[PDB]
Symmetry: C2
Subunit: 152 residues, 2 copies
Amino acid sequence: LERLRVAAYCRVSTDSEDQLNSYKSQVQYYTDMIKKNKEWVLADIYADEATKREDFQRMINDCMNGEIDMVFTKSISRFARNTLDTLKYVRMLKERNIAVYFEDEKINTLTMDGELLLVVLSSVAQQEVENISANVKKGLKMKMKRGELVGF
Amino acid sequence: SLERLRVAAYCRVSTDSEDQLNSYKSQVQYYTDMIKKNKEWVLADIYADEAITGTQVTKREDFQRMINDCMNGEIDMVFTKSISRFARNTLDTLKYVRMLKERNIAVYFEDEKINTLTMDGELLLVVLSSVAQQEVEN
Ligand code: NA
């Protein structure tokens, strides 16, 4: 090897009046940005229109195969669909010493700030799961099966 | 006549029984001992809402009382066990942390080891903002 293998993960906008989030604009942005650093080599640019589906999954498989050392992505909200998936995929990369760099938030997931990200997400996810569970139990009680308003 | 640092504790308490370490009186003892270790600190109050352990089923009257006391200038900092045992969701965590921060009132989340007035607190606010944005976008 030698060079750090750098990928980018992109969410592509469904229009058009948003050229900045177009596929082509993002391909050029990341290709040029990663070329700024001669210690790095571009692995690939991965993009789905919209964790997120097919190219995200291709990226994860390339990570499991040792093709990528660091993934750029614009934001947590583009990286994955929810807290639980953000945890899952950040941790899966981290166990293999693969960093994600969240550009908007300015967080490399392998730093102590990365560790705090994961602590905060774990607490957030526990609360979200308990909230769903509470809401499900409340919802069951709302259903009228005693002939409250209408007889049998 | 400069007053000691006025420390509140926010707690979700259990009436079970099978969980007496989460009782009101166990919590009073815990925070009494902590504040005793620091001669420059004084208890503002214990703020405690009854809640079912391992759940988000919780009262909110004391949380509201605490927020009012913070806005009324009675409290310099708030200890609380966890993000998941404080406000009820992400948007509310953001709302209340920001409101306290605007008044320079620190919350210390004990399990996460996050003081909301430090750089870690700035990180907490960005990560929570991202979680909220992530919901909106997905
Ligand atoms: Na004291």
